Ligand binder design. Structure first.
Ligand SMILES: *C(=O)[C@@H](NC=O)[C@@H]1N=C(C(=O)O)/C(=C/OC(C)=O)CS1
Ligand SMILES: *C(=O)[C@@H](NC=O)[C@@H]1N=C(C(=O)O)/C(=C/OC(C)=O)CS1
Lengths: 358, 356
């Protein structure tokens, strides 16, 4: 790596790991379009297995960026429209509160207060229909953004209905394969288990538990190499050969709603660059990031803005992830750890690094 | 051309020219991506000059397709947003009816009843300001569509302000040049007058008159070759090398509003394909039809299975362009008489339906 990349990464990430007591960490910096990789510590503390370029980490809510782009691709294929009623694709969802809730509201957490989590007790398809049929909204559609796994989770499940493919099969064949993400999985197969990091929570080794709509909201596992490729793809979508995927990545960075200084994409969130770092740093703390906020519709949505900070945080019980990039600067960063440590500390580190390099 | 293309075109266009008494016509069929050209009759009856592939015709309102694409390319550049208020780009528009009227409303005829024509007495840009300030909407913004040159014409004018270029210069540098439309003009240069057809209105030779926002709403002249290249560009925007233009073409074919079976783009109008030919044939015809619109929220990106089209007339010319992206199929009809729109649509549908 150029010395200026090594110096700012070492000075920022290495101390963060000490401060947060992170067992293992991989970071990619994309600089003038090319990836540079850094690794620390252990994937599995008991085995003393080092983090490598092949180590798979739980991306947690970073998965929503794959879901947003898979939906973007289905729109480009003309299979779905974000203006369509949710009930077009789930004809069994007939209760009256759903009138007026569209795929756009599910994808952007604006349906009117669908809950942060799908309840743990929901296990079957039948449980899931009953939970949505029984949900009562806190606000009208398209008035309030409330971050919610049960919102974008349902979007992803419905987006793939026209294709007839399972969500996993659509994600593999339409997104992971065309981008050569060859070590990225919704369900880690036996061959990859030896590379699958353990997460650490209260010192115990953990992996995420099965949950309804887990694949669509928080279920992707990936390596630092494949996430570097994912950043590159989202930095420069016109390089992607497959027309509908190139389109889908562009649609996932369109600005659909504005709250404060952020804009909501499909999975991705965006702010103009240069950003106020205190804004993304404080905004990432869960007391703000999970609060309801009033949205202004952006009518029609602004196409992807090059001069943006585009980012997403993600956590599972044992893992904490962050991805951020600025298309205009051909610059990005991926940070994967096998401990769930506070968001502001991720955003602050990533900001220090990217701001040094632009 | 392949004998089947030849035969469908000639058995359609021959009787059209006879029945409508058209003095000169040029047609291009785009079939599997490649252009095939046909020409008939006279560009200049008095001078006995035939229509050729280099004859310029007035496109009339087909010019709005170039204005919608130039707008789409300005949005792709980040210079404007369709969600911007009009007053952002013309802050002298202080009259209170302008609050809430966006560039999207201007581009799609939904501002609330701006009129079809800018009145003839509007010359200067101060007369133009006074016209817009004094205009009284019939409706709230985004509730009814009323086709209007004064609506998309102002959109064209404002969309280029951040660029710092004249509308003509932006159109030249950002659309005509990149697409090698080198015989397409807002103002026909002296060197190209020998190729400018006359239009014919009641047997008299006529050309379009200057008027305010003419360039933006109805003032482009072009050849059948350059119009075939325009149709190719709109059929396959992914082949275009300039990234903002490729995107601008896509934005112009997004579906912003629905009324009946038709969707409004930026300049272009679209229907799902296959189309009921009655929907487009009668649909193309009335001096004012005000139609309620449903917003497409958010707009649908350009749908490949569409019949995408635009009609156009000036006092002496009648033009039509239609294409179907998923079949790589298109047609351009240019004539130097303004004959009824249903006759245009009917011919076009009878040709393209036969070729797919
Ligand atoms: C995605 O990461 C998702 N959690 C998935 O398991 C979101 N991120 C959170 C976080 O940043 O920590 C969430 C914490 O939720 C709480 C504190 O209840 C949940 S939503
Ligand atoms: C463009 O062609 C424009 N005339 C410009 O000089 C419009 N042309 C019409 C037409 O195609 O005949 C118009 C019909 O008006 C309606 C009701 O759409 C509008 S003026």
């Amino acid at each position: 790596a150029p010395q200026q990349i090594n110096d700012i990464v070492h000075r920022t990430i290495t101390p963060l790991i000490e401060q947060q007591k992170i067992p293992g960490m991989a970071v990619a910096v994309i600089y003038q379009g090319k990836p540079y990789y850094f690794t620390w510590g252990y994937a599995d503390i008991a085995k003393k297995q080092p983090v490598t370029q092949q180590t798979l980490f739980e991306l947690g809510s970073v998965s929503k960026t794959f879901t947003g782009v898979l939906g973007g691709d289905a729109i480009a294929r003309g299979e779905i429209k974000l203006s369509d009623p949710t009930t077009k694709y789930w004809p069994e969802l007939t209760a009256k509160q759903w009138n007026g809730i569209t795929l756009l509201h599910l994808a952007t957490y604006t349906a009117g207060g669908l809950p942060l989590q799908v309840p743990d007790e929901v296990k079957s398809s039948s449980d899931l229909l009953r939970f949505y049929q029984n949900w009562q909204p806190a606000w009208a559609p398209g008035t309030q953004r409330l971050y919610a796994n049960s919102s974008i989770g349902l979007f992803g499940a419905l987006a793939v209905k026209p294709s007839g493919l399972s969500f996993e099969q659509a994600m593999q064949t339409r997104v992971f394969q065309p981008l050569k993400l060859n070590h990225t999985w919704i369900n880690v197969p036996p061959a990859e288990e030896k590379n699958y990091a353990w997460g650490y929570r209260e010192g115990k080794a953990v992996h995420v538990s099965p949950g309804a709509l887990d694949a669509e909201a928080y279920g992707v596992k990936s390596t630092i190499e494949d996430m570097a490729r994912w950043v590159q793809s989202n930095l420069k979508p016109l390089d992607i050969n497959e027309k509908t995927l190139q389109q889908g990545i562009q649609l996932a960075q369109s600005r659909y709603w504005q709250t404060g200084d952020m804009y909501q994409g499909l999975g991705w969130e965006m702010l103009d660059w240069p950003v106020n770092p205190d804004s993304i740093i404080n905004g990432s703390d869960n007391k703000i990031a999970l609060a309801a906020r009033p949205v202004k519709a952006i009518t029609p949505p602004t196409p992807a803005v090059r001069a943006s900070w585009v980012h997403k945080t993600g956590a599972t019980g044992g893992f904490g992830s962050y991805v951020a990039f600025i298309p205009e600067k051909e610059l990005g960063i991926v940070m994967l750890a096998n401990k769930n440590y506070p968001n502001p500390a991720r955003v602050d580190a990533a900001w220090q690094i990217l701001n040094a390099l632009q």
